[PDB]
RNA sequence: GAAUUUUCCGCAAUGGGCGAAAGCCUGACGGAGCAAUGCCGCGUGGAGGCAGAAGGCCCACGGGUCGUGAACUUCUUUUCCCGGAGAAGAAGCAAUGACGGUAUCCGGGGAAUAAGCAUCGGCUAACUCUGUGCCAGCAGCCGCGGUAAGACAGAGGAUGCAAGCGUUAUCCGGAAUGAUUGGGCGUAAAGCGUCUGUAGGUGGCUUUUUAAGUCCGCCGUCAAAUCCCAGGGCUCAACCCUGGACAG
């Protein structure tokens, strides 16, 4: 029971001496609004078959988003994947999802209803939709920072 | 010289009337060096700060018609 | 050379955790010994001790790593200097940075001594912001 | 009154000394220190202070249009270039 | 124009959801089609059609709504909910939920023709914000009209919203407190409308 | 980023700025008399007979202007009023003509755009 | 010149000049007039009404749509109009006003007097049929037109906004495309051909001291009015206003 939506249907064509043929590509993102996303890129001859294969690749690369709070992000994070750079900042329980055309499509599925961002560098829908995934994977919460951090011998509780 | 009265800030029918501490050689509604208190005509709002008055009047300040009457309407300026 | 000894420790620990090493040896100075003290009180490292190589005094700095994975999670993800030599940053009681919303801290040298992000707010003092650890 | 310190660069003037005041101040838009140096024409009726001496300048009565400052004390001796 | 005049149930159709511009009309849209599968609406279409649903329900303009969403953004508290606070406090909307008028466009005419009294004094303005503990009642002269009598004859049986309390005999309704999220029964997502104004 | 100490020496600041259409001291519209009303051919993708007229402005400059719509009545002594907009198909033409003002008449039997082209309301 | 107004009324109110006063002078000013120049509010109708009437547009002509839209019916009538009352801005103080047939209030006719503009290929939210047919024309950019082009011209319909709409001009934003917060220089624009070196920038480690920078607190000033927070008054709002905050 996951929600499915398309980002961009790109037209990629190569010319041979045998004519002009194309293999359509589509980016589909999945989600259940509880804090679970997954992007998928699939290439096929037709438009309907390119959306189908990208939906099967989306439910395979499943990553958990550690948001769980009052419909917002835990902290500030800046990640750069290639030429594309996206900045994700937390917001108050009244702001909408003021993020990019390829960024808002992955954030509405993550459960984050309150978020503010910017689209820097390259404005390609392929490199920016995956740059937000690398930025959401490196997200830490108050409990897992202290568990990642190796504190010395403190007083042990039962 | 310096004197006491009221300026204009509220235009049209609503004449609010400002505070005072201005010279005679200046404007009707211009520069004011110090603040005191004011009154609103069609309301029960009457301020007029008493520690600011009498402290300004001792050093050559002239009490003109409009600052008067609103002075005796309150508990200040009587045989006390 | 050594233009800033407060900047090379930041580089020596950052490159050491990326290639997962056990012990690093940095130069011995009183101000840098004060930074490694408020690093272990928060828990970013194990401990710090005194050492000597060849008539030169060095400081032992043992790092801490998490559980075993494909690439084990590091204690300090990023280490960067704010008050770089030739661009000295100074802040008051209100201009003190809130790093990661309370998760990470920023170590600053104040007039009362050497305080952190939470410690400088309780005393009501400010100063030169050295670096930020998270 | 304001007090500013500086070194004397020129002494070849009748009862007047050229004092160069160095002042370090951070930029409000940026962060780093920008050094500004302006020379003041100080008064010295006793012609005691020569070239190379670092003196402090206080505000006083204008003896001319360019001169308004006087040199009252002396913190250190000659700190100039060798002949 | 202050309040849209002309075709009312054209916007109850097309949009999918059914608001209260009149009483109750069919689910289906305009033209010969629209009863089948519609085309894929873009990401900017969901932000444009959702704000036009909130703008038409109350019978408010774009110039007046622009102020009620900006002052609510500058004010403290949850922005998404305080848009529906200053919009529900209007004298033309609190009159619909009172049972004195069958719909909202007919409730603006009721306030404009001097039929409603607020705390004893007479108010003509529909865009007037009604603060708590206020008595929204009818006038003694306009108590004998057949339109006001017919609308309040159907009200003693139906249940009115929890933030309001109507007394059927003296024809007066009091407003106790502010309306919250679970108290609103409209088919509108308040997070899609606040995202439109900040493009 | 260019280093902080070079930003005090040089200090980055923009230019004097070049205008797209020199309509004097920030004036929206400008008046002028037409000198020569001729016909010219477009660029490479288009091929038509477009009507362009050389307008002598109030400042003393003689720049070209495009006439919109079907049919006009501009002579050698017509006092016209310019707009200020490029066509990007005809080289040198950076201005447009506002019809329905002064000597420039509006387009006959046009029912669509009446705000532009300068057409009146038909009864 | 693209473009910016009544050669009006008054001292009544506030203020200025003079006078122990009265009072006089006062297009400062208080008001009115012209102009949708902008901001704000209201209005030009409300409910009910057919099995979806004429008449248009599309049509596979079996219909659909414009359309509840209209007509037809009950209903209310702000504002405009007409008539009668009538707060306050006057404190002074033979009771003193320009504005005023003022605000506002009561009543009487009757919906009766009141909407348009742009757009509809994509970004841009909204469709087809004709005519024309790279012809005439469109156009912010990519671009449309050489016979069936939703991007020309008209019509039907739809969308947006509103007495405003559209166009143009101009600054900022989008341009982390000068980036201090925010960018780069092997090949995309970019290390000067290579050294020495003055000014300038930066500078290892220890202790003491200074403490100038810096930091804490406090005292001045940072005019008022904007902006912001909370709270009041014109029926709301615009507007006006108290205190505070801020003035880095």
3D architecture notes:
The structure is cut from a larger assembly and holds chains A (158 residues), B (80 residues), C (134 residues), D (83 residues), E (199 residues) and F (123 residues). Chain A is an alpha+beta fold. Chain A has 2 domains: 1-64, no CATH class; 65-158, Ribosomal Protein S5, domain 2 (2-Layer Sandwich). Chain A has 4 helices and 10 strands; from the N terminus they run E-E-E-E-E-H-E-E-E-E-H-E-H-H. Chain A has helices spanning 48-56, 104-107, 131-137, 142-146; strands at 3-10, 13-16, 19-22, 25-31, 36-43, 63-64, 77-81, 84-90, 97-98, 115-121. A 4-stranded antiparallel sheet of chain A has the order 1-4-5-6. Chain D contains no helices and 6 strands. Helices cover 0% and strands 52% of the residues of chain D. With 83 residues, chain D is mainly β. Chain F has a single domain (2-123), classed as OB fold (Dihydrolipoamide Acetyltransferase, E2P), CATH 2.40.50. Chain F has 123 residues and is mostly beta strands. Chains in contact: A-C, A-E, C-D, D-F. Chain E binds one RNA strand of 248 nucleotides through residues 1-3, 5-10, 22-23, 30-32, 42, 44-45, 48-49, 52, 61-64, 67, 74-76, 91, 101-103, 105-106, 108-115, 118, 121-129, 142, 145-147. It is classed as ribosome. Keywords: spinach chloroplast ribosome, ribonucleoprotein particle, macromolecular complex, ribosome. The entry is titled "Homology model for the Spinach chloroplast 30S subunit fitted to 9.4A cryo-EM map of the 70S chlororibosome". Chain A is Ribosomal Protein S5.
> What spatial order of strands do you see in the largest sheet of chain A?
1-4-5-6
**What is the number of strand segments of chain A?**
10
Number of helices of chain A: 4
Radius of gyration of chain D: 14 Å
Shape of chain A: elongated
- Spatial strand arrangement across the major sheet of chain D: 1-2-3-5-4
| Measured distance between first and last alpha carbons of chain D | 37 Å
Could you describe the largest sheet of chain A, including whether it forms a barrel? 4 strands, antiparallel
The total domain count of chain A is 2
- Termini gap of chain A: 40 Å
| Rg calc of chain A | 19 Å
Approximately how much helix is present in the residues of chain D? under 10%
Strand content of chain D: over 45%
PDB class: ribosome
Keywords: small ribosomal subunit, spinach chloroplast ribosome, ribonucleoprotein particle, macromolecular complex, ribosome
Entry title: Homology model for the Spinach chloroplast 30S subunit fitted to 9.4A cryo-EM map of the 70S chlororibosome.
Chain A: Ribosomal Protein S5
Task: Write a brief structural summary.
In chain A, 16% of the residues lie in helices and 34% in strands.
């Amino acid at each position: 029971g996951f929600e499915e939506n398309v980002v961009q249907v790109r037209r990629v064509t190569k010319v041979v001496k045998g004519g002009k043929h194309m293999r359509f590509r589509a980016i589909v993102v999945v989600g259940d609004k509880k804090g679970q996303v997954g992007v998928g890129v699939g290439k096929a001859k037709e438009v309907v078959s390119a959306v189908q294969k990208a939906a099967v690749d989306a439910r395979r690369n499943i990553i958990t988003v550690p948001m769980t709070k009052y419909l917002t992000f835990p902290h500030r994070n800046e990640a750069d994947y290639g030429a594309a750079r996206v900045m994700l900042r937390p917001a108050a329980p009244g702001t909408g999802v003021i993020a990019g055309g390829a960024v808002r499509t992955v954030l509405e599925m993550a459960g984050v209803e309150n978020a503010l961002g910017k689209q820097l560098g390259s404005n390609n829908a392929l490199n920016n939709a995956r740059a937000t995934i690398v930025a959401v994977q490196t997200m830490r919460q108050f409990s897992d920072v202290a568990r990642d951090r190796g504190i010395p011998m403190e007083e042990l509780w039962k | 010289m310096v004197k006491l009265r009221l300026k204009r800030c509220g235009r049209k029918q609503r004449a609010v009337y400002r505070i005072v501490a201005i010279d005679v050689r200046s404007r009707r509604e211009g520069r004011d060096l110090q603040k005191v208190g004011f009154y609103d005509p069609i309301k029960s709002q009457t301020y007029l700060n008493v520690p600011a008055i009498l402290d300004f009047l001792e050093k050559g300040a002239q009490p003109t018609e409009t600052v008067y009457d609103i002075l005796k309407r309150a508990e200040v300026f009587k045989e006390f | 050379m050594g233009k800033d000894t407060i900047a090379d420790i930041i580089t020596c620990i950052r490159n050491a955790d990326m290639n997962r090493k056990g012990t690093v040896r940095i130069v011995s100075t009183n101000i840098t010994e004060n930074i490694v003290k408020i690093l272990l009180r928060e828990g970013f490292i194990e401990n710090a001790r005194k050492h000597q190589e060849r008539n030169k005094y060095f400081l032992v700095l043992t790092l801490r790593h998490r559980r075993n994975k494909k690439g084990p999670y590091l204690n300090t993800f990023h280490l960067k200097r704010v008050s770089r030599p030739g661009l000295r940053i100074y802040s008051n009681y209100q201009r003190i940075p809130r790093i990661l919303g309370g998760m990470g801290i920023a170590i600053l040298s104040t007039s009362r001594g050497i305080m952190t992000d939470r410690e400088a707010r309780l005393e009501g003092i400010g100063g030169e912001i050295l670096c930020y650890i998270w | 009154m304001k007090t500013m310190q500086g070194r004397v660069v020129c002494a070849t003037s009748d009862k007047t000394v050229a004092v160069e005041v160095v002042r370090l101040a951070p930029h409000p838009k940026y962060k780093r220190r920008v050094r500004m140096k302006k020379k003041y024409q100080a008064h010295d009726p006793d012609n005691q202070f020569k070239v190379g001496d670092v003196v402090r300048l206080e505000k006083s009565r204008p003896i001319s249009k360019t001169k308004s400052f006087v040199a009252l004390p002396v913190i250190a001796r000659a700190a100039r270039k060798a002949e | 124009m202050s309040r849209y005049r002309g075709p009312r149930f054209k916007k109850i159709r097309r949009l999918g959801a059914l608001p209260g511009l009149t009483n109750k009309r069919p689910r289906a849209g305009s033209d010969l089609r629209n009863q089948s599968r519609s085309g894929k609406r873009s990401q900017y279409r969901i932000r444009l059609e959702e704000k036009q649903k909130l703008r038409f329900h109350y019978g408010i303009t774009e110039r007046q709504l622009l102020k009620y969403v900006r002052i609510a953004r500058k004010a403290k508290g949850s922005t998404g909910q305080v848009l529906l606070q200053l919009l529900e406090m209007r004298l033309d909307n609190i009159l619909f939920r009172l049972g004195m008028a069958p719909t909202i466009p007919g409730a603006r005419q009721l306030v404009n023709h001097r039929h409603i009294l607020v705390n004893g004094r007479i108010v003509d303005i529909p865009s007037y914000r009604c603060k708590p503990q206020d008595t929204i009642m009818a006038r003694d002269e306009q108590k004998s009209i057949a339109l006001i009598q017919n609308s309040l004859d159907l009200s003693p049986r139906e249940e009115l919203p929890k933030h309001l309390t109507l007394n059927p005999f003296p024809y007066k309704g009091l407003v106790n407190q502010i309306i919250d999220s679970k108290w609103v029964g409209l088919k509108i997502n308040e997070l899609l409308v606040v995202e439109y104004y900040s493009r | 980023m260019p280093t902080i100490k070079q930003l005090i020496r040089n200090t980055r600041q923009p230019i004097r700025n070049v205008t797209k259409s020199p309509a004097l001291r920030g004036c929206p519209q400008r008046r002028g008399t037409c000198t020569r009303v001729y016909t010219i051919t477009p660029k490479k993708p288009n091929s038509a007979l477009r009507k362009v007229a050389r307008v002598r402005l109030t400042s003393g400059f003689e720049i070209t202007a495009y006439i919109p719509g079907i049919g006009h009545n501009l002579q050698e002594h017509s006092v016209v009023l310019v707009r200020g907009g490029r066509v990007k198909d005809l080289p040198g033409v950076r201005y447009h003509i506002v019809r329905g003002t002064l000597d420039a008449v509006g387009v006959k039997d046009r029912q669509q755009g009446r705000s532009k082209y300068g057409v009146k309301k038909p009864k």
